[PDB]
Amino acid sequence: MTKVGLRIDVDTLRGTREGVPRLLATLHRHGVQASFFFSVGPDNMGRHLAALLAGTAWPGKNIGNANAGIIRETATYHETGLHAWDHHAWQTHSGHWSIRQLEEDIARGITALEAIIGKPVTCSAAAGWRADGRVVRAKESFNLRYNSDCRGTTLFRPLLMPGQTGTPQIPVTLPTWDEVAQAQSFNTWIISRMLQDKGTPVYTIHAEVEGIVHQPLFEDLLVRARDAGITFCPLGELLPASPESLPLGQIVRGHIPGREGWLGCQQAVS
């Protein structure tokens, strides 16, 4: 039996409203505990040009204000953490932002999420994986249990400077749907990839996709993974008792097939 961390990205109001409760019903039926990362601030996801009315040229609606009961309900049965304040803003401008500006944005998000759920937030994940070393320094202020800011191969402590390591990093090791899409073969291929990972396999889905349109597909993936020997757990479950066991690494600006843009890429040391 093979533990695969299941991460779920929520980036829009409609993913939170309609995607998450369907995901909650599905995961409850199939005994699966997962890890949700909520975008709680403005839905400006439309500015990339229902998404046509997603803050395309006007302030977007607060996702966490408009869904504070779903979010609350999620954090009752799942590890819960912070995806973004303004997802569009982070993935578009964070690479030019000062370390103060990254700190301030993570603050805004963490506060909104703790206002909704009423308990400490222990993990986070940069929108679009738009993170690097500066984001590591900015996230060190909040001293979270772990963070999932990059694509890599296995969990690791980032090295901030010689002798000092940061808050542990739980990378996404597997490609996503939208990077590979045939649809009926994708489940069989991703299960193969989950079973042959040499690291710690962490899979990422999106509440806008696997929670809405491709919910029957993702529920099939649940069934087949149970049978091929896989069990999905929240990412934090993959940490050992001592973060000392985790290897040293960094996050650097790299590129991945299927994504247009740079993103955070785990690396080894010097």
CA–CA distance, 136 with 134 (Å, rounded to integer): 5
Rg (CA), the chain: 17
Experimental resolution (Å): 2.6
Third-level CATH fold of 2-267: TIM Barrel (3.20.20)
Q: Give me 160's structure tokens.
A: 């901030």
151 HSE (CA, 13 A, CB side): 19
State the DSSP string of the chain: -EEEEEEEEE-SHHIIIIIHHHHHHHHHHTT---EEEEE-SB--GGGG--GGGSSSSSPPPBTTTTTHHHHHHHHHHSEEEEEESSHHHHHHHGGGS-HHHHHHHHHHHHHHHHHHH-S---EE--GGG---HHHHHHHHTT--SEE--SB-SS-BEEEEETTEE-S-B--B-SPPHHHH--HHHHHHHHHHHHHS-SS--EEEEETTIIIIITHHHHHHHHHHHHHTTEEEE-GGGG--S-GGGSPEEEEEEEE-TT-SSEEEEEE---
